[PDB]
Design a binder for this molecule. Structure first.
Ligand SMILES: Nc1ccn([C@@H]2CS[C@H](COP(=O)(O)OP(=O)(O)OP(=O)(O)O)O2)c(=O)n1
Ligand SMILES: [Ca+2]
Ligand code: NA
Ligand code: NA
Ligand code: NA
Ligand code: NA
Length: 326
DNA sequence: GTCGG
DNA sequence: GCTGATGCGC
DNA sequence: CCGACGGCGCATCAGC
C-alpha cells in the first residue's frame, strides 16, 4: 500500500471524523461514509493537491472535497480542532475504547460525571459484566498479536479441541488465516458431524470448558449454544514476563454450512463484498451460511451442497484465490 | 456523507 | 414470569 | 428529492 506521507494527514482527518460520528453523533452511516473515503484515499497512489482531485474517487463527495481544501490550505480542520478540545465529546469518544461501552453507555456515563478510566474504576457498580472485563483489560485489548503468539495459541486450541472429541473440526480464521504478520484477536470456527441444518448437545460448551480447565480461557464476555466471546492468555514460563490477555471468539457452525462460514469469517470482508456483488452479477446469491442460485426475479432456490471452500469458486467460475491474496 | 433510483 | 426492542461487537 | 447504507448472536432493558 502507498506510504502514509501521501495524504496521511487527510486519511487521519477522515478517520477521526469517522469516530465522532459513530461515538458522539450516533450517525453510523456517516461513520462508514468517512471510513470509505479514507480507504479509497489511502489506496490512491498520488499526493492529493486539491479537493477536486479527491472528488473523482468514489466515496468522496462535495463535503469531503471542501474539507480536503481547508486542510491543504491551513494544515487543520476547524470543526475537528473544536470537537477535540470539547471535554464532553472528547470523553464520550474516549470511553468507547472500552469493550462493552458503546456510544449510548458512553454518553450516559459522561452525563453522570463518569468521564475517565479512573471514574469507571471508582464506579464498578454501574458497569455490566462485559464492561468490567473491557476495563480490566483495557491496554491488553488495544495491543496487537504477533503471528508467533497466534501460532502458540493455535496449538493450544487444536490440541484441546481434538482431546475433547477427535471428530471436532477447528479452523482459525480472520487475518491469521490470510497469513497476516500480526492479528487483532483470535476467531475460531468449530463444527462436528452431529451438527447440521436439521438438528448433539453441548458441543460448544465442552470445548469452552476444556480451555478453561487448562487455563487458556480466563474470562467470558458472552456465551450461548452457537457463539462464545471471551478472553484468553498464553502461559509464561517461571520467572518469565506475563503475556497480555487476548480476545478470542469461538463460533459453532453446522457441518454443511461450515465452508461458507470459513470463507466469510476468513475475510478480508472487502474481498467478500466484492465476491457476492460479483456472484449476484453472474446469477448466484451468497451469504455467511450458503450459496443459492437466483431464478432471475431473483428467486433464490434451495441452498447448494458445499464440502470445500473451492466449490464456491466453481459455481461463480471465479478463479480461486487462497487466503493470503485477500 | 455519498450514491443513485 | 414472558416476548420484543435495543445495545454491542464485528 | 430521498432512501439505502451488513446482518446476526448474546446480554439486558422496556413493557405487559
Ligand atoms: N462488513 C463485513 C464485516 C465483516 N465481514 C467478515 C466477518 S469477520 C471477517 C473479518 O474479521 P475481523 O473483523 O476479525 O478482522 P480481521 O479478520 O482482519 O482480523 P483483526 O482485524 O486482526 O481482528 O470478515 C464481512 O464479510 N463484512
Ligand atoms: Ca479477527
Ligand atoms: Na471508534
Ligand atoms: Na465522488
Ligand atoms: Na466500546
Ligand atoms: Na471480527
Amino acid at each position: 500500500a502507498p506510504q502514509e506521507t501521501l495524504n496521511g494527514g487527510i486519511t487521519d482527518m477522515l478517520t477521526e471524523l469517522a469516530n465522532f460520528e459513530k461515538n458522539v453523533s450516533q450517525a453510523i452511516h456517516k461513520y462508514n461514509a468517512y471510513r470509505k473515503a479514507a480507504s479509497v484515499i489511502a489506496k490512491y497512489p498520488h499526493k492529493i493537491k486539491s479537493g477536486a482531485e479527491a472528488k473523482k474517487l468514489p466515496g468522496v463527495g462535495t463535503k469531503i472535497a471542501e474539507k480536503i481544501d481547508e486542510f491543504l490550505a491551513t494544515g487543520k480542520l476547524r470543526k475537528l480542532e473544536k470537537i477535540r478540545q470539547d471535554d464532553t465529546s472528547s470523553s464520550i469518544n474516549f470511553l468507547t475504547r472500552v469493550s462493552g461501552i458503546g456510544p449510548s453507555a458512553a454518553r450516559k456515563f459522561v452525563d453522570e460525571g463518569i468521564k475517565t478510566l479512573e471514574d469507571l474504576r471508582k464506579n464498578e457498580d454501574k458497569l455490566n459484566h462485559h464492561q468490567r472485563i473491557g476495563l480490566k483489560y483495557f491496554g491488553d485489548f488495544e495491543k496487537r498479536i504477533p503471528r508467533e503468539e497466534m501460532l502458540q495459541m493455535q496449538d493450544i486450541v487444536l490440541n484441546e479441541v481434538k482431546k475433547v472429541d477427535s471428530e471436532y473440526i477447528a479452523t482459525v480464521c480472520g487475518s491469521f488465516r490470510r497469513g497476516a504478520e500480526s492479528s487483532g484477536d483470535m476467531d475460531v470456527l468449530l463444527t462436528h458431524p452431529s451438527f447440521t441444518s436439521e438438528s448433539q448437545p453441548k458441543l460448544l460448551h465442552q470445548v469452552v470448558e476444556q480451555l478453561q480447565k487448562v487455563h487458556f480461557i480466563t474470562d467470558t464476555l458472552s456465551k450461548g449454544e452457537t457463539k462464545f466471546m471471551g478472553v484468553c492468555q498464553l502461559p509464561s514460563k517461571n520467572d518469565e514476563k506475563e503475556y497480555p490477555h487476548r480476545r478470542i471468539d469461538i463460533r459453532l457452525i453446522p457441518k454443511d454450512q461450515y465452508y461458507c462460514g470459513v470463507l466469510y469469517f476468513t475475510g478480508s470482508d472487502i474481498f467478500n463484498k466484492n465476491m457476492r456483488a460479483h456472484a449476484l452479477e453472474k446469477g448466484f446469491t451468497i451469504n455467511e451460511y450458503t450459496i443459492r442460485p437466483l431464478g432471475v426475479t431473483g428467486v433464490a432456490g434451495e441452498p447448494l451442497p458445499v464440502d470445500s471452500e473451492k466449490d464456491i469458486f466453481d459455481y461463480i467460475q471465479w478463479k480461486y484465490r487462497e487466503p493470503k491474496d485477500r
